[PDB]
Each structure stands twice: as structure tokens, then as C-alpha cells.
Ligand binder design. Sequence first.
Ligand SMILES: CC(C)C[C@H](NC(=O)[C@@H](O)[C@H](N)Cc1ccccc1)C(=O)O
Ligand SMILES: [Zn+2]
Length: 866
Amino acid sequence: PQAKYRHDYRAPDYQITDIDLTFDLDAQKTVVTAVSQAVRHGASDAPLRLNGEDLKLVSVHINDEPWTAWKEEEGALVISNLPERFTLKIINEISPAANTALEGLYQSGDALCTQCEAEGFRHITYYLDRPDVLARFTTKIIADKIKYPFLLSNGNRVAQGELENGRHWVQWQDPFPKPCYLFALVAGDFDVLRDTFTTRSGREVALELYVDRGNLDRAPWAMTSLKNSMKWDEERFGLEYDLDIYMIVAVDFFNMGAMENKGLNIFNSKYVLARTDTATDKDYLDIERVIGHEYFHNWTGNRVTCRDWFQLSLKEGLTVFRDQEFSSDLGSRAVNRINNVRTMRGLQFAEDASPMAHPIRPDMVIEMNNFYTLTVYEKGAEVIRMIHTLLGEENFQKGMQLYFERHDGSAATCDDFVQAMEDASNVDLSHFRRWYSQSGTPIVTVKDDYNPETEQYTLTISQRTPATPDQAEKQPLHIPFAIELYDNEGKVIPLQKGGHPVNSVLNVTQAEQTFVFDNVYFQPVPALLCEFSAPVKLEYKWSDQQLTFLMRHARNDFSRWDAAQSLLATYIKLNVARHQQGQPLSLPVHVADAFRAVLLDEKIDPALAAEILTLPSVNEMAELFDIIDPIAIAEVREALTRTLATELADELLAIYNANYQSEYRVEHEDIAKRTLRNACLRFLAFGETHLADVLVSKQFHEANNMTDALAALSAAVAAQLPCRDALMQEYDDKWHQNGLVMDKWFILQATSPAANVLETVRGLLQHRSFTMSNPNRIRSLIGAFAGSNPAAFHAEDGSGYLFLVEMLTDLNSRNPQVASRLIEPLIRLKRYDAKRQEKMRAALEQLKGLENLSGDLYEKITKALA
Ligand SMILES: CC(C)C[C@H](NC(=O)[C@@H](O)[C@H](N)Cc1ccccc1)C(=O)O
Ligand SMILES: [Zn+2]
């Protein structure tokens, strides 16, 4: 399995300008005929090298002449002695029914569908499977009419006929040149929700949402979100849809969440199907996000695509930035910013400290599907947001406009995008480009001084990025560091120096620098790195009272929540050391009081109150420690929950009851009150046992929506309440026929604090609703245990590791892309104590000796064992 290197990029020897595909479709045996119009660019003696995986070649013709100057090798068809321009015809067979890996053409229940990104099209036919080759596709599909009445591909429906023996065919044509990763085909029998969107310039777009028969009742919300996404992209970015049809197909069997195939998105049905009794507020907001995200790729990804896969972040970071802007504009900006920062600090930082650490533009890749990461996505989007911060909205939109103007119709690079932002704005981004090529999280250390005699405040800011496995050399970055200074009244002190205003976004571009502010009439309380202005670790010696002052006075809701996190961080760390010495929780009175004040603040946005009253996850808590103690973290989280439930019992029950809502609305103000109410419930579940059991049981049974019912069930599990087993059994009996709803239940089982959690998880491998054939079920049961129950996964007897090895031994052959998502908890071994590393190392060595080890797992295992 060979590494590929970004510095090896070379323009292709041949282009394909047009491809005409014919699928004679059958689950056991599909015959693909592919007629491509090719043009030599390279040396006249260069062979055409086509990618192909698991393809049965039937014939090779060049201008209709059967070709003798070719050979097959590992993953390729090499064709020699070609004219400068020619028609390539390939005929080959593939077998959808045998495709367990779910890449290329496969079976989803009774449907046939495709997944081609990153390199899945070479599983369908021999092709230039590289994103800088853009061709105009036309696609004829021939299939059994009763089994596949709907035959879908990208673009517009240009031809159709019937044939003998109950077959029919449809031809599609997509006028936009595309890399083959954007190719899609779907065959099956669906219910179809149809609607329309009229674009701002009056183009009328048929919207079509394909769902399994019987699911039309779960489709309107995805349709609404689609129109919302199209409207928003017009208002915010000035971007209109460019075709006449927009199709989305919800499939149950899918390795990822969704895919932006031009004019024909394929979606995991998890990101389509919602009804108020099956779906939570979080599902609704996720559907909106993911619908919007694939929609936004129509421009940032499709109209302008990626020159090579090392440029992935060019589309993913930028499209994540967009879906965050969408969610934030439509919903609560503060809650969105808070949650995206949780993800950054709790999940992405961990990856940047891992053996899989990489720059947002990687330099080296063995298996490209291994790089659809928190780094390329979430940190990518933080980098885009820093550009936005440096340029401001107006110049940022100008840089978007110049980007499309220069690159519409072509495959571009990260550096092109930076270049467009830089030229449109006249902001210098040459230093800034270092964020693309350097991995690891910078640590920004702040020291301050107030001088009463000169009324000057001085910040001495430094930065370093520790070395990572992949990079021995590190250099300072261009770090936009936003500050605000508060006087004793909570008023913002104007920033200025020598009689002139100073931008509150400081340019931290050196290893060490000093910033001096004048006319600081009172010793300030600083808010630092406001709105998480650079993806960095902040090191500043806060006092508790600086932090409670910020919770009370900071202008932006994000800084209030962030202050609360810095306050908690101190006491999480205190109490994990205590836990390790056998000592019970200790928390000063004035900390509990900051949280009492939040509960009883009548002016606070409930959306903000709810986030402050949501404790860091065990994953955000882990990132406060060099060496992770997963059991101490888990138990301290619980003890902190119990302590606050006891100290704030009366205030919690009052705020819980005050936020009752008899109507269920998917509306942001209602979501916010319900999130606060359920945050109050979480603590109440951990107070006095009889009261808790009554409250939780009652909520589960009286809920008129899945949000309140799951919140209850999930508190029953978390606090191991007496009602737990009956409620869990009831949900099983009601919902077992419905995989997406049962995924919620598998997650709760997988993340239970019960002593016997692993025994229960293993038994659930035999559950009526579970199957190894379904990525959703695998992730919900096995992935949630290994990744979201660190206390049990890291049981000291090493039983967690052995369990995962067993599962990955299966999945390595069945579905390597899911195997490689699931191995991730094991590759974090260097973060754990020496006894744990030794057991995890041993598990990894077991996996490395597997016969037919997939490249997907090979890459991670070898970096981890190094
Ligand atoms: C980031 C989210 C909004 C959803 C996310 N999907 C995407 O990013 C799509 O735009 C990707 N282009 C789909 C993808 C993901 C992983 C591997 C190959 C292809 C997914 O998880 O599928
Ligand atoms: Zn994407």
C-alpha cells in the first residue's frame, strides 16, 4: 500500500472531455459500457493509465478497433500507442450484490445506488479517476421495470424507452463538466415528494426527494430545509442553483452522511427523515445542516472542484464554514458557535495531538478516505473563518466573487482560494498560508500588566506549536487574536494607542510580541480570543472572579459560556487528581453560585443558559490532561453533576417547570427553552432518587415529541434510575422496526455507566434491530461504545480493546471505511497510561497481522504503532 505525496502532483497525460455511459443493470451482474472522448496532452509515447478496482474487463476499442496494445496490472489498465485524439470504449462487468464495502455501485435494501467520492468511480469502470479530469457525462440506464421503476442519474432526463422482457431505460445528460467523483446513479422504487423553488432571477427548479415507500410523511422537513438553503445561499453569497432539477435520494445503507453528486445528492436517510415522534430538535437541526451543506457544494465543490485530493479542504473547510454560517444566520449564532468550539477543542485538538495529525492540506496520503477528518473539515472551516475575521464580510464576499470568476468550470487548489481572497481584499495572506501546511494546535500564552501611573495595559502574547509525529519543524502562524477589555462596571474600554483607535483583532504573527493600550482608565478584565478567533489553546492565569465577572458582563454570549468553561476547567482538573488519590469532589461555594446565578438570571437567553448548564463532555474533559484517565474523568463528571444537582435542586426544578411547553414547535425560541428544560432535567435525574425517578418516568410517558422522550430515557440510563429497564424495554417494543430510531437506543446502551455495559453491548450484536451489514447500526452500537464510552472501552482488564479487535477483524473485510472510522479510539494509545498503552499496542499488532489488511486500516495502525 503506497503513500502518495502532494508534491508529486503532475498535470494528467490525457484528458477525457466527454463520457457516454450505459449500465445494463442487475444486482448480480451489471454490464457497463463506457465511451470516452480522449485528448493527449502529454508526450506522444506516454501510455494512457486508467484506474480500476475489482472490474471484469470484457473489451477495449479505440475508434471502434479492438485494441491489442494494452495490459492490466494491479489497479490499472495501461493502454499504449494511442493517437492524439480518440474514442475509448471500455466494456466491463461489476457485481452490486457483492459490494459490501459500499463504494462504487452497490445495493441499499432493494435499491441500487452509488458512492464515488473519493475514488469509487474506478470501482464501476476503468477511468481517469482523479478530480482534475472533468468530462461531460451522459448516462443511459437499462433495468427491470418492476424492480427499478425510477432510474436516476445527474442532470436532465433526455431519452427513454421500453424494451422486451419487462425492461426499460432512461438516458440522463449533465451539461456541466465534472470529475467522476460527482457521478451518481440510483435505481429503485420510491415515494417522491415534489415541490419547486424559484430562484431570485426567476429560474424554476423542480425539487424531488426520493424516499423508501411509506416514508413520504418523514420528507417535508428536508424539503423545507432545501428551500431554506437555496434562499440563504442567494441572500448571503449571491449564489443561485444552475440546473432545472434538484434530486435527493435518502438511502439506508451509506458509509457517510451525504454526498453532493451534481443535481443528484445521495443522503444517509438519517439526514433526511424526520417526524416529531421519531426525531429530536438535534435531528431537525442536523437535517437542516447536512441538506444545506451538500447544497452549498453546488458552487464550493462542484462549479469549482479540487485539482487533487490533497486540496480536499478547499471544498470541505469552505463548505463547512458555509453550513455553519447558514445554521447560525437561521438559528442561534451563539449556540452554533459554542457547539462548533466544543467540537474543535474536544475532538479536533485530540486528532491534532494524535499519530494521524495532518495539516488541513495534507502532504502525504495512503488512503484518501482516511482524510475526511475533523482537521480537514472543522479546522478547515476555522481557517476560512480566520480569513473572514481578517477581511470582514464585504471583502470576504469580494474574494468569493473573484474565486468563482477566476475558477468557475475548473479544478482549483487551496492556494488559488487564498490568492483570490488576498487579491480582492488587498489583505496580505502570505504568512497566513502557513495554516494550510502546518499541523498541530498552537498554544497562545498571554501575560498582562496594568500601569496605574500611565493608564496603560500591556499584553505580552507568545505562541508555539509543539512538534507532531508528521512534522519535526514548526513556525509561528498569523493568529488573529480578538480581545475586549472591561472596566469595573462591565463597560467596554475603547482600544487605542497614542491617540488613535486600535483594531480589537490583534495580529499575533511572532513567537513573542507586546501590545500596549493607552487611556485604560481602570484595571481591565480582559476577554481573550473572543468568539474562538483562532483555533488555538489559550493559556492565561484567570482568577475565578475574572471568570464570573465575564459570565455576568461579557458582551457576546460566547464569551460568557467560554468563561464558564475556563471556570469549570480548573475544578475538573482539581477533582480528577483527587479522584486518583481516592478523595471525594471539592468545589468552592462561589462556583456553584455562578451556576445558581445563571439559572435564576431572568435576562439571559435560555439558549445560552442551556449551554452553560451543559457540562463539558468526557471528550472535552480529556483535552485538559496530557495523560488521559478515562475512569476518573467519567466519575468526576458524574460527581460534579450530583453536587450541582444537590446544591441547585430547588432552582433546577423551578426552571425545569417554568420552561414547560405544551405545543411542540421546531422553532428556535422553543428549541432553546426545551434545551434548558432538559439540561435542568439532566441534573434533576441525579438528585434525590425517588423524586428523580418520578420526574424522568413522567417526562418519558407524557412527552409529545422525541426530544423530551429521549432526554428522559437518556437521564434514566445516565443516572441508572429504577425506571431505566422498563422505559428501555418500552422504547424497544415500540420502535424496534425503525433502525434510525433504534440507533438512539443503541447509543444509550453503548454509553451506559452500568458495570455490565460490555456484556450488554455484545448481547446486542444479536438484537432484532442490529445488523453488521448497516453502517448506521455499527456506528450507533459499536462506534458509540469505543468512542463515546471511554470509561468502559478503557476498562482496566483490557476487555474493551479485545471487543473492538473482534469487530474490526470482521469489518476489515466487510467494510474497511467503517472499520477505519471505528479504529480511531485505539490509535489514541499514547494519551493513556503505560499499562493501557501496552494492551492497546497489543490489540493494534493483532490487527496489523490480519491477512488481507485493508490499506484504510494499514495507514492508521502503522502511524499508531510507530
Ligand atoms: C460534513 C457534513 C455536513 C456531512 C458529511 N458529508 C460531506 O462532507 C460531503 O460533502 C462529502 N463530499 C461526502 C464524503 C464524506 C466522507 C468521505 C467521502 C465523501 C458526511 O459526514 O457525510
Ligand atoms: Zn462536504
